[PDB]
A paper describes a structure:
Muscarinic acetylcholine receptors (mAChRs) respond to the neurotransmitter acetylcholine and play important roles in human nervous system. Muscarinic receptor 4 (M4R) is a promising drug target for treating neurological and mental disorders, such as Alzheimer’s disease and schizophrenia. Our cryo-EM structures of compound-110, iperoxo and iperoxo-LY2119620 activated M4R in complex with heterotrimeric Gi protein unveil the binding modes of diverse agonists and PAM as well as activation mechanism of M4R. The overall structures of the three complexes are similar, with the root mean square deviations (RMSDs) of the Cα atoms of receptors are around 0.9 Å.
Residue numbers in the entry:
A (entry chain R): 29 to 224, 391 to 471
B (entry chain C): 7 to 63
C (entry chain S): 2 to 121, 124 to 235
D (entry chain A): 3 to 54, 182 to 232, 240 to 354
E (entry chain B): 3 to 340
């Protein structure tokens, strides 16, 4: 059990480093007035969502793993699953609105940044979060209530509504694959618009490929292995979905670090904070 | 033009030449003398007490 | 920097009328305007407050809710709508402009104003004497005492001294105790400590005779003292 | 609280002042500031007249874009002493008279000026929209006399296309760094109305650069 | 003609430097021996005034030790309060490229000098309250580098061309043209008695002048590059100048020679602004490197650093009463240290 608790401490250290990174990036946003631009409100919202997911997912998933089954109560477990899943959807829709921001910035830079002002960013972040909540949280909490019985087992507490994938697949596709499709489309167009010097194109295209492929590699596997189970259960054993969970959480971990490293001023402010101590 | 400019240069040069001058030791003593008299009145030199320090709160 | 008001007149009790003042020759937007009304045989009392950008609005306790005051910067006019007219409402209203910053002189210019007539928890400003007899060329001192200490933590007192002439609108005299206003001769001076305050006039000219006024600015009822006449 | 009523009115005034400052900064950031420069006896007045003391600021809007144009060439002082004040300009409109090649010589003086300006530490990332003037007169003068007089290292002949390409590449190669900035060149003459169009296009390209830098998508 | 005059000028220069060497018997370092050092001095950021949005070039405390005037890269000259960090006035000037901040001793006028060789006098306490252009002083051929105030009636202006000036406020014409210099001019700080003021050369020449007569009295040399900022000792007998050579050099007006240099091997970046403190014991000097430094005027040993900015400290000033010091750098933020 010593090796397993060591792995648990490794996961905890990952949680600590990701929450530290998020808090550092948002403190950098706060202290630096230039970083408080309208284009960074979206990044601040993403950093907050990453704090939420990293702080309230790692420890509870480890204490799920410790016994294999869920040790805590059904209501608290369902609340935790609802909160984790809603913050995940909030993060992904925030990334989508960031992609829309990028598209409008590059395609039409003459009038759009003046037209957006600052109310538009707040309206976007609030709308994204509330849309994620209304789309996903109440079905999560109320699937057991509607049927009136614990469709998932009490011991291995899980997400409830996957017991019937028919109601899950369409809305999950609308929540992820459509964001996948439109984010990839917008990034392809942002490269094509930046085509209108060649080293700049190569390196901006490399960065957009890096971000898009990180998003795909660290989000798609979970939402294809939750989709393929619409006809079988023994195909994917329980231990397999751990890698999918960790893969999504690695996506959440790498979003802020990559986004901060992609800008010089972010790491400059990080060095300033380190010097200040 | 240039000749007159250089002539006024040399006129100014003898202007700063003819001045009466004090010894550098006396000058240093006078610079220190102003410091000692106003040493207590200097707020940055010694930590001013909190109550009469108006910038702290 | 003239301030002229329009409206008012004989109104049946309980009626509604619009009281508007026109501003010209000075930057209206930065300034925070005021309304103070005077009965024909009574001293003044504060009525309403407006701020730059209309962010902050305050009223007197008696006139709360019933009145509505809103400034129109592009129109360069401040207008006050008048409701629930009573015998305590009939008066002449004074248009007051004030700017608030460090070293500012709030309440420095007062408009002529207009008269409105109808059918017929506050700190107190007290004045020891009224209609005091005085001789020209002498020194006269008038006391205005506040129930609440006006010194505050900033160390600056907040009593404003105003001078009224027969048939003339009041002007600012002491924008803060021991601080003299522009356009005012050096004869006037002020001094006081704690709550006990006084205004000292070194010499008296024939023009500078009439009712004097004192107020407070720590809090917002903006109370005035009962005026003191000066008798030759 | 423990603030006076007039102190609260003053903090309200400070908030109003901050709001006005925010509005002014928002409407000023969207404006594009183009630093105009050039060599001695350059056609700066001519290029200003084509569009639409010390500094003569120019106000004009093109395609819903208010431009700032600053004919700083009429200063007659030490550049490296106040050129730090011009950090952050969207672009540096450079002016080089082509025809003054036979005319210490004007072309090499302007080349030294360009080397300094483009390699100044304040303009590490500000793109330069280079302009070359009087193409027709330069062509006539090249047909009259060869360009080799100004350039001892010239290898081509006396033809318009090759001469223009040679001088363009010589000016472009002057940059010590070429990844952070870019040099946009337009051969312009007196009867060239498309100058405002080229300025607009170069400003669009550079502002796409700036926005992509700011967004961190890089 | 020319040869004779140049050679006699060289002979005069040799004579004056030899006579200065005759006067210099013992240096200030030897004079101030066995004296208690001030020790390490640390001053925290009491206030960070964040009104501005661009580079800050100049800043000047007031006589009341209460109000701050801060120029900026944009057309703003927002006047600050110190205790309650309000914005008393916001001045929308026209020549956005400004590098001067002059605050009248009476607190009634504030002056700014743009890069367009124009010094603009702004009224503060006026009927119909808002800042208005009092006068537009013109007549220079170069950019205004620094401006001061004798009183509400006269203003001394350093200019890019090698000439200072004592202006008239009522009539725009200047009463005395101070063209007895060479190079460029950067800094000028008046004496406490408003009688003598110096000039900040671009060729290491701190020239003391006379406001009434109209010619130099004592020419100073000693740096190998341009001198940026000058500030008088509180007595008005000496001053220390900060050049681009990363050297603070303290002069005097009764020996016309150096007293001591302030140069550290670590610092290679030059001085942008220098300003003494009360009693003149400290020597506060801004630096091109993202840091400000505290010295001692009698001993070259360095006091505590004054850092915290993200860009070079372009201006520095100490309150007249000496309570505290504010720092203004090219980051919009201005820090006041006590
Ligand atoms: C959410 C969940 C469900 Cl819904 C589940 O049951 C799946 C199932 O039987 N299907 C497929 C066949 N259909 C007829 C009905 C639905 N099995 C596991 S296992 C595990 C985990 O996370 N295991 C971890 C600890 C290693 C889950 N989150 C999970
Ligand atoms: C299930 N968990 C919250 C652990 C991670 C996940 C997921 C997928 O959820 C969504 N994808 O796109 C939109 C919502």
């Amino acid at each position: 059990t010593v090796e397993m608790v060591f792995i648990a401490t490794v996961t905890g250290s990952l949680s600590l480093v990701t929450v530290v990174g998020n808090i550092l990036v948002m403190l950098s946003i706060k202290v630096n007035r230039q970083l408080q631009t309208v284009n960074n409100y979206f990044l601040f919202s993403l950093a907050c969502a990453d704090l939420i997911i990293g702080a309230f997912s790692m420890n509870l998933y480890t204490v799920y793993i410790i016994k294999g089954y869920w040790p805590l109560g059904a209501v608290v477990c369902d609340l935790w699953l609802a909160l984790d899943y809603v913050v995940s959807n909030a993060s992904v829709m925030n990334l989508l609105i960031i992609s829309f921001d990028r598209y409008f910035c590059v395609t039409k830079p003459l009038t759009y940044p003046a037209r957006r002002t600052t109310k538009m960013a707040g309206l976007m972040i609030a709308a994204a979060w509330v849309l994620s909540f209304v789309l996903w949280a109440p079905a999560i909490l109320f699937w057991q209530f509607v049927v009136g019985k614990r469709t998932v087992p009490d011991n291995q507490c899980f997400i409830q509504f996957l017991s019937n994938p028919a109601v899950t697949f369409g809305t999950a596709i609308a929540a992820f694959y459509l964001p996948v499709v439109i984010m990839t489309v917008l990034y392809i167009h942002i490269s094509l618009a930046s085509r209108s010097m060649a080293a700049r194109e190569r390196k901006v295209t490399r960065t957009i490929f890096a971000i898009l492929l990180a998003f795909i590699l660290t989000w798609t596997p979970y939402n294809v292995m939750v989709l393929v189970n619409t006809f079988c259960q023994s195909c994917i054993p329980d231990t397999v979905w751990s890698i999918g969970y960790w893969l999504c959480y690695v996506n959440s971990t790498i979003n802020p670090a990559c986004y901060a490293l992609c800008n010089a001023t972010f790491k400059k402010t990080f060095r300033h904070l380190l010097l200040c101590q | 033009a240039s000749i007159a400019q250089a002539r006024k240069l040399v006129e100014q040069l003898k202007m700063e030449a003819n001045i009466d001058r004090i010894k550098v030791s006396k000058a240093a003593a006078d610079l220190m003398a102003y410091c000692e008299a106003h040493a207590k009145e200097d707020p940055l030199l010694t930590p001013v007490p909190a109550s009469e320090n108006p910038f702290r709160e | 920097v003239q301030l002229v008001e329009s409206g008012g007149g004989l109104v049946q009790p309980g009626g509604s009328r619009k009281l508007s003042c026109s501003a010209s020759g000075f930057a209206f937007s930065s300034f925070g305007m005021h309304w103070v009304r005077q009965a024909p045989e009574k001293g003044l009392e504060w009525v309403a407050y407006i701020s730059s950008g209309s962010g902050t609005i305050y009223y007197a306790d008696t006139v709360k809710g019933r009145f509505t005051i809103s400034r129109d910067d592009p129109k360069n006019t401040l207008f006050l709508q008048m409701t629930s007219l009573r015998s305590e409402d009939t008066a002449m209203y004074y248009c007051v402009r004030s700017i608030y910053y460090y070293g500012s002189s709030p309440f420095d210019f007062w408009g002529q104003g207009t008269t409105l007539t109808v059918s017929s928890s506050d700190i107190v400003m007290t004045q020891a004497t009224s209609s005091v007899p005085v001789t020209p060329g002498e020194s006269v001192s008038i006391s205005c005492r506040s129930s609440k200490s006006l010194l505050h933590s900033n160390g600056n007192t907040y009593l404003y001294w105003f001078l009224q002439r027969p048939g003339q609108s009041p002007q600012l005299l002491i924008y803060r105790m021991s601080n003299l206003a522009s356009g005012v001769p050096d004869r006037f001076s002020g001094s006081g400590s704690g709550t006990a305050f006084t205004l000292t006039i070194s010499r008296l000219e024939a023009e500078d005779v009439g009712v004097y006024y004192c107020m407070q600015h720590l809090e917002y009822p903006l109370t005035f003292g009962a005026g003191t006449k000066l008798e030759l | 609280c423990t603030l006076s009523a007039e102190d609260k009115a003053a903090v309200e005034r400070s908030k109003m002042i901050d709001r006005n400052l925010r509005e002014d900064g928002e409407k000023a950031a969207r404006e594009v500031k183009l630093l105009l420069l050039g060599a001695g006896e350059s056609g700066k007045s001519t290029i200003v007249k084509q569009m639409k003391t010390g500094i003569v600021e120019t106000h004009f809007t093109f395609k819903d874009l208010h431009f700032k144009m600053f004919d700083v060439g009429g200063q007659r002082s030490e550049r490296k002493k106040w050129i730090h004040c011009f950090e952050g300009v969207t672009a540096i409109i450079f002016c080089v008279a082509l025809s003054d090649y036979d005319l210490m010589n004007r072309m090499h003086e302007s080349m030294k000026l360009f080397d300094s300006i483009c390699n100044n530490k304040w303009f590490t990332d500000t793109s330069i929209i280079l302009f070359l003037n009087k193409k027709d007169l330069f062509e006539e003068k090249i047909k009259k006399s060869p360009l080799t007089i100004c350039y001892p290292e010239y290898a081509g002949s006396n033809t318009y296309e090759e001469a223009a390409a040679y001088i363009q590449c010589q000016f472009e190669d002057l940059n010590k760094r070429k990844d952070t900035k870019e040099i946009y060149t337009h051969f312009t003459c007196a009867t060239d109305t498309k100058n405002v169009q080229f300025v607009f296009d170069a400003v669009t390209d550079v502002i796409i650069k700036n926005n992509l830098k700011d967004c961190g998508l890089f | 003609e020319l040869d004779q005059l140049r050679q006699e000028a060289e002979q005069l220069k040799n004579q004056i430097r030899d006579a200065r060497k005759a006067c210099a018997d013992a240096t200030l370092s030897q004079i101030t021996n066995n004296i208690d050092p001030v020790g390490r001095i640390q001053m925290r950021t009491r206030r960070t005034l964040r009104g501005h949005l661009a580079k800050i070039y100049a800043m000047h405390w007031g006589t009341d030790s209460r109000l701050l005037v801060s120029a900026s890269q944009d057309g703003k000259l927002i006047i600050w309060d110190s205790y309650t960090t309000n914005k008393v006035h916001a001045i929308p000037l026209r020549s956005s490229w400004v590098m001067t901040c002059a605050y009248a001793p009476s607190g009634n006028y504030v002056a700014c000098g743009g890069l367009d060789n124009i010094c603009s006098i702004y009224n503060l306490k006026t009927r119909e309250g808002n800042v208005r252009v009092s006068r537009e002083l013109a007549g220079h051929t170069g950019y205004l580098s620094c401006c001061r105030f004798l009183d509400d009636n006269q203003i001394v202006t350093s200019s890019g061309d090698t000439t200072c000036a004592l202006w008239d406020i009522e009539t725009g014409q200047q009463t005395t043209t101070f063209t007895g210099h060479t190079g460029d001019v950067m800094s000028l700080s008046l004496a406490p008695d408003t009688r003598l003021f110096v000039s900040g050369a671009c060729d290491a020449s701190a020239k003391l002048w006379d406001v009434r007569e109209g010619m130099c009295r004592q020419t100073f040399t000693g740096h190998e590059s341009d001198i940026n900022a000058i500030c008088f000792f509180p007595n008005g007998n000496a001053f220390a100048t900060g050049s681009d050579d990363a050297t603070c050099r303290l002069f005097d007006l009764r020996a016309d020679q150096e007293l001591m240099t302030y140069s550290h091997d670590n610092i290679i970046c030059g001085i942008t602004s220098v300003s003494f403190s009360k009693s003149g014991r400290l020597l506060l000097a801004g630096y091109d490197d993202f840091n400000c430094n505290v010295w001692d005027a009698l001993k070259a040993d360095r006091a505590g650093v004054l850092a915290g900015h993200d860009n070079r400290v372009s201006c520095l000033g100490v309150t007249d009463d000496g309570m505290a010091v504010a720092t203004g750098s090219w980051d919009s933020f201005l820090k006041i240290w006590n």
